[PDB]
Amino acid sequence: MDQSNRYANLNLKESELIAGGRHVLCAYIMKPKAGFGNFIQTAAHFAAESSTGTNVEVSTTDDFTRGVDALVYEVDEANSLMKIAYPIELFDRNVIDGRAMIASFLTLTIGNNQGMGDVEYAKMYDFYVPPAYLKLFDGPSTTIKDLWRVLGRPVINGGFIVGTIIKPKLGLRPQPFANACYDFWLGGDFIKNDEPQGNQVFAPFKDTVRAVADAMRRAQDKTGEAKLFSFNITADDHYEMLARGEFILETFADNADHIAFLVDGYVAGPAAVTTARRAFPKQYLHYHRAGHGAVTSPQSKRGYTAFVLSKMARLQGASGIHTGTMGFGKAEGEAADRAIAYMITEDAADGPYFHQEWLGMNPTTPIISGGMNALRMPGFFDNLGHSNLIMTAGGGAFGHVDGGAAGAKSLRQAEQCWKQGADPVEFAKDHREFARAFESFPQDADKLYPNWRAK
Amino acid sequence: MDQSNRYANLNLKESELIAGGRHVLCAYIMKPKAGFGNFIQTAAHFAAESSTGTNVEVSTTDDFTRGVDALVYEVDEANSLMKIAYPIELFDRNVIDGRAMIASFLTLTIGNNQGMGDVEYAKMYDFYVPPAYLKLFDGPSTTIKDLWRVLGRPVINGGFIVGTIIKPKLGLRPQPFANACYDFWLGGDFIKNDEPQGNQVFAPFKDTVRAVADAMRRAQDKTGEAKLFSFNITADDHYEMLARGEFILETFADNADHIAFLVDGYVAGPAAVTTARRAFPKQYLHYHRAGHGAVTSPQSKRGYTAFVLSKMARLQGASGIHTGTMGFGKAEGEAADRAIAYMITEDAADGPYFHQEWLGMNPTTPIISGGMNALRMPGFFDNLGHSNLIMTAGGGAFGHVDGGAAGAKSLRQAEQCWKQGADPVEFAKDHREFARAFESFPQDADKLYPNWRAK
Amino acid sequence: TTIKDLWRVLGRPVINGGFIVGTIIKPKLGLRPQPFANACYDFWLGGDFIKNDEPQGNQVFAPFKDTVRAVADAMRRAQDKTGEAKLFSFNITADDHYEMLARGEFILETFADNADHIAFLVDGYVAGPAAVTTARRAFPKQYLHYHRAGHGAVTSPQSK
């Protein structure tokens, strides 16, 4: 069945759809499956399955229904590009507070359309959200502004936050876990649970939280510096998340505002993120995106990009989200991913297809992680252009030859080197911990700095 | 860095790992990227990023940590097969009730390993859960048994539940929506919200629920038969889900046990499914998997298959989940998908790699949906072997030439035909609504039964 | 929840999993927290199941939370010694609904990975159906143990 006449209107202008402010726009890279309809026909059926229609006409359809049809307004079969306009009336709203839910945006714009039999693949690269819909999203309630304040930094451009992940990913019992925390904090600011760390039988949650709380007090008393921790509170059960969050804050007491909450937002889902966002709005919401690679990878032609995930996360209210190393680390990623960072930090930014005004909605911090160490940092910052962010280096810190504390300081000095505009090798002469990172990871040193041994 | 010696032990035997009952087993189809390590090295790194390790050695590692390492115990580079054993101690547990969470299973077994730079792609096709871990999951609290009981059917092999989806997907205002419900119920049993239907501004939640409740009462009084409805209560906010569920049960009153709760479990996440499962254990939990196609499609080489999704859903506690049309409908799917149904319905069943004993855990109903109609049903049942399930046909019912009521009966008569083992064309002669379905969808009739008009 | 869920915890077949060896901690009242737990440990060396005697709860000489902790210790020690799973049925009976929740929640949190080894006992006849439903609905995943103390006032054939 051909549904082009109803669900496609290429005479529509994007500038007018945007100016109207009554449509969510979504840009897909789509290719029809072979043996079915052409591009516009497939795009039309795509729009139908994403709004008001099914695979056949139904008698129950009326004119009011047609008014809220999602419309294909622009196609480019040569570049496999497809743009669809979704009337904002389609998207579900909370009965309790009239606010928007990302779950509805997902169900419509990238739901059933991913299982279409006449489609080979389709993947969202960008979307635009107008003011009337944008202002209905929670947005972040806590930002890096609040972490900077705890560290005693300026609340505007407070600078680089030295971070790490406790490694091993799993296996440390409560006190050995806390000992690694104390060590790193002697040189660093920020520590986060590795994503699966929680209430394993060999490391009970409450015992670990107490041990870490003790370590924070000892580290802070020792260094005279404020220290931060990001606890994983991910769970299937909403009430388990509350139980964990409430215990952590009560346990840390006067250090409660030094605490961030980590949520495995991609595998646990938006529901888990919102649980954290709404139950603990005064605590930095740390969005961990474990599993995202199943769709965000360029190897995947389905789902949505990392850029889309990151943009959605800001609406959901993540205080910060992992954006990747932009090709400088161990995970898949490219230098062009810097655009993702700008989209979640700025009040106005360009996506791959749409320009987005955020209307003063708070920013989401780019959390940089994945095989980072002191050696790889200068290059990363060159590509990004700033260091006002959190970077966590698990292996990069605890893999340091002189231990976690030295590892922390190497990360600190690595960033100091970049802002100083100094030569890292020349810089190493006057900064031991940074110099010792060359010996900690000689293969990285050999490729990045070919003749470091001579100096 | 080569981590094979630690994270790979091919001398381990699967039969013994299963007999041990201390390991979750996962079977992946993985291909290393070019320019990195070989297959076993990559598989070893995979296990490391999926359990205890990172991309470099850390000083904090001890012998206890090694004891809980995930181990690559079987590989087949020719078939790109990789099997990994996860010690069950790795997986997170609720502090509040000591029970398991699927979120932890996801974070470890298909989390960060999907973003690895040295891997081209990796996708889980099967997993095994031993008794000690299995019994810690919620499992379903309500089954089709409870819907059969409400319909007045036998609680054992109570038979086919005629269902539909209210179409248009969106656009119907409260009363026209309820009118369509009334019409279908004149011939059918079961109605579900189309996945995005909730609290749209043109169709307020509370207004729609009240109108549908009225339709149920009128239809039941008219036909003298019990009728069922599955309401979408999906939301980002846990408390929005509670509010929707509570209002529905209170509104329907003495028909409250006629209500199922639908959750968009893939896009809203496991957290949303558990909210419904635990808040409303006495209400049939209807798992809608919108968006799953982004990873489950055979076109995707990442994430996990529909089989894995469905098996997980049973652990999560879905009363029923969409399993697809198995190649007989509009969506991507194959005839071999019958194995998925058996895995969630039987107490013992075979996966593509692992045999699973469920230890009396309740079954999850296979919900058949996606471009189905009366004509396509006999073929589907032939492949499955039974009709003890819910089938919903949106277009197939409301696309019927004589309307939804006639549409319902065509679905009813279609299954009666298969149950009687009669010839559909011959059967149609004595059953009009079924016969009229041929004219409703002539292309399907022409392809399935080439010479139907003469008779 | 049914006996099937207890059989599963014991590692028994979920169909006709067989006889569950049980006892009641005696004296009915009088044992302090650790002596209570010691008796639990002793019985578990040969048995499967232990229940609070019906009035045992939060007596001043045997505080609830202290006893629960000591019993959890006994279960872990017994299980490590015997290599067998052990069960306990805790009395959570109370006039106050929220007292019942508090007792149940504390027990499950305390036992942690052994939480599914826990049953909840309710004096359903004297406390009433309201108390039984509190447990049934608050803790549907925990075996609900109905104790009928006082029933004889009407159930006896001597009563008409």
Ligand SMILES: O=C(O)[C@@](O)(COP(=O)(O)O)[C@H](O)[C@H](O)COP(=O)(O)O
């Ligand atoms: O588990 C890990 O691998 C990490 O702790 C990195 O460890 P290392 O610093 O030791 O490499 C992070 O969770 C990943 O960076 C997540 O990736 P992303 O930020 O792309 O979501």
Ligand SMILES: O=C(O)[C@@](O)(COP(=O)(O)O)[C@H](O)[C@H](O)COP(=O)(O)O
């Ligand atoms: O919105 C829809 O398309 C449906 O209501 C079917 O409508 P029709 O009956 O009109 O085809 C179902 O949600 C899909 O079947 C989901 O697919 P799956 O079960 O594969 O997850």
Ligand SMILES: [Mg+2]
């Ligand atoms: Mg991590």
Ligand SMILES: [Mg+2]
């Ligand atoms: Mg639907």
Ligand SMILES: [Mg+2]
């Ligand atoms: Mg007694």
